[PDB]
Scaffold this active site. Sequence first.
Site, PDB file in Angstrom:
ATOM      1  N   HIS A  41       0.751  -1.262   0.000  1.00 55.45           N
ATOM      2  CA  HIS A  41       0.000   0.000   0.000  1.00 55.45           C
ATOM      3  C   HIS A  41       0.777   1.306   0.000  1.00 55.45           C
ATOM      4  O   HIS A  41       0.206   2.365  -0.277  1.00 55.45           O
ATOM      5  CB  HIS A  41      -1.049  -0.006   1.110  1.00 55.45           C
ATOM      6  CG  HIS A  41      -0.469   0.097   2.473  1.00 55.45           C
ATOM      7  ND1 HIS A  41      -0.331  -0.992   3.311  1.00 55.45           N
ATOM      8  CD2 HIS A  41       0.014   1.163   3.152  1.00 55.45           C
ATOM      9  CE1 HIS A  41       0.192  -0.594   4.457  1.00 55.45           C
ATOM     10  NE2 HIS A  41       0.417   0.710   4.382  1.00 55.45           N
ATOM     11  N   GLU A  72       0.925  -8.396   0.723  1.00 59.18           N
ATOM     12  CA  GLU A  72       0.948  -6.986   1.151  1.00 59.18           C
ATOM     13  C   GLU A  72       2.337  -6.415   1.322  1.00 59.18           C
ATOM     14  O   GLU A  72       2.530  -5.490   2.097  1.00 59.18           O
ATOM     15  CB  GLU A  72       0.203  -6.797   2.478  1.00 59.18           C
ATOM     16  CG  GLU A  72      -0.059  -5.321   2.860  1.00 59.18           C
ATOM     17  CD  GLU A  72      -0.942  -4.590   1.844  1.00 59.18           C
ATOM     18  OE1 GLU A  72      -1.815  -5.255   1.223  1.00 59.18           O
ATOM     19  OE2 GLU A  72      -0.759  -3.352   1.675  1.00 59.18           O
ATOM     20  N   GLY A 146       0.563   6.204   9.858  1.00 59.34           N
ATOM     21  CA  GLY A 146       1.949   6.735   9.849  1.00 59.34           C
ATOM     22  C   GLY A 146       2.980   5.732  10.358  1.00 59.34           C
ATOM     23  O   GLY A 146       4.218   5.967  10.268  1.00 59.34           O
ATOM     24  N   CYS A 148       3.077   2.493   9.118  1.00 60.66           N
ATOM     25  CA  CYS A 148       3.327   1.438   8.126  1.00 60.66           C
ATOM     26  C   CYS A 148       4.727   1.419   7.575  1.00 60.66           C
ATOM     27  O   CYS A 148       5.339   2.450   7.325  1.00 60.66           O
ATOM     28  CB  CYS A 148       2.240   1.363   7.019  1.00 60.66           C
ATOM     29  SG  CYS A 148       0.645   0.958   7.820  1.00 60.66           S
TER      30      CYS A 148
END
Lengths: 181, 181
Positions: A41, A72, A146, A148
């Site tokens: 992402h 992911e 914030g 990740c």
Amino acid sequence: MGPAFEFAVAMMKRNSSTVKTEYGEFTMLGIYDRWAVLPRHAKPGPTILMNDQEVGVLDAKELVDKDGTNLELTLLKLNRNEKFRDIRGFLAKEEVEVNEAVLAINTSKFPNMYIPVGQVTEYGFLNLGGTPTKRMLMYNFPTRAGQCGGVLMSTGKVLGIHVGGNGHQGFSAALLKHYFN
Amino acid sequence: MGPAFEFAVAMMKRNSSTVKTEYGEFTMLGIYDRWAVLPRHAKPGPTILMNDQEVGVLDAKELVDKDGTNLELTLLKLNRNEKFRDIRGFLAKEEVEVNEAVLAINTSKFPNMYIPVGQVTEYGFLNLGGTPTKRMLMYNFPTRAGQCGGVLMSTGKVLGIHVGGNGHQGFSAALLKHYFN
Ligand SMILES: *[C@@H](CC(=O)OCC)[C@H](C[C@@H]1CCNC1=O)NC(=O)[C@H](Cc1ccccc1)NC(=O)OCc1ccccc1
Ligand SMILES: *[C@@H](CC(=O)OCC)[C@H](C[C@@H]1CCNC1=O)NC(=O)[C@H](Cc1ccccc1)NC(=O)OCc1ccccc1
């Protein structure tokens, strides 16, 4: 728990950086060579800001398992002449479980902050923000945006990369050894 | 450094809370009894939100030294029936210096995050945001807003409370034993 933090702090100092893409600001772990890793992402573009410096991204692999299910993580190779201290030996072959983990974050919102998220169990399957996703680790800690790209650690072990949460649980994608050679 | 974090984490778990006043959100350390401490600039009102709960503030002392100079701490007594584990024994008689400190923060912006700010030297005099201030500890860490009330620690020692910084240095008011009996 101390030894975990002690490991965390040396690891981040040696292999982490703060990255900007168009999707936000992220913590980034250099794995070996010129290869690092971001949460998927982070959707990184053809160039990135790495510690405030333009770096072009030579390649990028959005990882899925055999059945194609979301993992992911995105891996990226970077044209810089500098080579990351190879830390592949710290990455496990299968999803780790620990009793005391530390989550490490290194951005503008959270510069060099560590969180004792305690106990991490393989969660496995999770429908993440609508997306079918697997190989998740789960920790009980009230995570926030914030965070990740945050690196999940115990003593001796890089367990994976932080990718989401909701109020009182967070989730990392397990960072497995074979994703790199 | 681990032992410092290890101490930090048990201390915060046992004596810290997240506080809201009208001036923002802060970390708060319970000292003994029903007495805790906030950075002066938290300017606490006649009531506070402590872990999301209204608590009335029985008293408040904005601390200055003999010559009247700013020390930047406010102490407050709280009508709750619960008594803080007395930690006065952890507070030094004069400004501490350590080689490895941890800064602990416990709010909505930073829930249970720890920062290895390394080495803390008595800075002493500082003109803080226009205000003449003394007894400051200084650490080299790129601090941020939302960190005030942050607790500065090493193994065995509560050194003081975080009160400011600018980009690449932060500053705590030294938390001295005699401020309480
Ligand atoms: C990380 C985003 C970030 O670092 O921003 C850069 C500036 C963020 C962490 C998350 C936010 C609140 N608490 C947290 O720990 N990640 C997400 O929010 C993550 C984003 C995402 C990724 C892939 C697909 C969809 C969304 N999503 C998330 O946490 O969803 C919550 C959730 C949990 C369980 C089931 C369903 C949804
Ligand atoms: C803490 C404020 C906070 O927690 O907000 C609640 C929601 C903040 C920490 C600071 C901000 C950027 N980096 C930091 O470490 N404290 C201050 O900003 C502090 C506020 C203050 C207090 C008393 C008087 C005036 C202002 N001030 C500050 O950091 O000033 C910078 C400075 C440093 C040296 C000399 C002069 C000015």
